[PDB]
């Protein structure tokens, strides 16, 4: 789920950037130091939209730079467990189906698309179900389910997807399911 958090911190203004507006330098330093950088308790950062810094900065021993208190708004995104999110198929192989989830790509394995027997990597690279008559390929719009996810900065797209739950799947699959349910 996409989030927007507000944060307060200390930003260091190098002496070579003196004589100009503190806000511009502060937002520049924040972008150079927080863009595309994973945070353990907040998630992966997608950028800084606005920042406000105080004009007073304190000086410490051994440094020529000034340190200012800054308040800024972030655009962090973190996929929350047990949430229904739409997505698109990015690549399909014997590994499974890779669904794109914004900056990262989700992962689902062949054992959990439909409660049946299916053959993957068939002719024309299409996953076809023997008793379901289902075809999935590029450009699809799937509505996936989150079951488990963890972040360690070793590999961002380590997200596991789920499709066994009814009322979930392709937009056409769910539409026919609803129509035939009643």
């Amino acid at each position: 789920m996409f989030k927007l958090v507000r944060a307060k911190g200390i930003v260091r203004i190098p002496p070579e950037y003196f004589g100009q507006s503190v806000d511009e330098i502060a937002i520049k330093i924040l972008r150079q130091e927080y863009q595309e950088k994973l945070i353990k308790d907040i998630g992966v950062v997608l950028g800084i939209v606005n920042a406000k810094a105080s004009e007073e900065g304190f000086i410490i021993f051994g440094d020529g730079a000034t340190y200012h208190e800054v308040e800024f708004d972030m655009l962090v995104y973190t996929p929350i467990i047990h949430e229904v999110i739409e997505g698109e198929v990015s690549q399909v192989d014997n590994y499974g189906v890779y669904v794109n989830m914004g900056p990262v790509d989700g992962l689902v394995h062949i054992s959990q698309i439909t409660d049946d027997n299916l053959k993957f990597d068939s002719n024309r690279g299409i996953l076809i179900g023997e008793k379901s008559k289902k075809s999935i390929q590029k450009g699809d719009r799937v509505r996936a389910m989150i079951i488990s996810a963890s972040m360690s900065s070793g590999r961002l797209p380590r997200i596991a997807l789920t499709m066994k739950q009814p009322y979930l799947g392709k937009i056409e699959w769910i539409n026919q399911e609803i129509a035939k349910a009643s």
Binding site: K8, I10, F58, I60, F61, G62, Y67
Partner: protein, 91 residues
């Protein structure tokens, strides 16, 4: 006695320059949970703490090398000196 002279004059940065920068300045990595000295692996690009693996975060601290030698010599005896860390700048 020269250190006492420098203290009497009130020169903190001169004391630092004489007694740390020009003799045995060093950098060590401390686990934030146990306060023991870790290391940088330089091959897997990760911080490793001896009781801790990669389950904790290590921070670099500039210190006199003789103080680290003293810490290791104290751990040679059955003594557990744990270093407590702090921030240079606070809110």
């Amino acid at each position: 006695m020269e250190r006492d002279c420098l203290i009497g004059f009130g020169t903190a940065m001169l004391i630092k320059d004489r007694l740390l920068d020009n003799s045995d300045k060093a950098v060590v990595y401390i686990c934030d949970q146990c306060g023991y000295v870790g290391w940088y692996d330089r091959s897997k690009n990760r911080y490793v703490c001896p009781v801790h693996g990669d389950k904790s975060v290590l921070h670099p601290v500039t210190v006199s090398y003789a103080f680290k030698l003293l810490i290791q010599e104290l751990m040679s005896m059955v003594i557990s000196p744990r270093l407590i860390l702090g921030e240079k700048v606070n809110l």
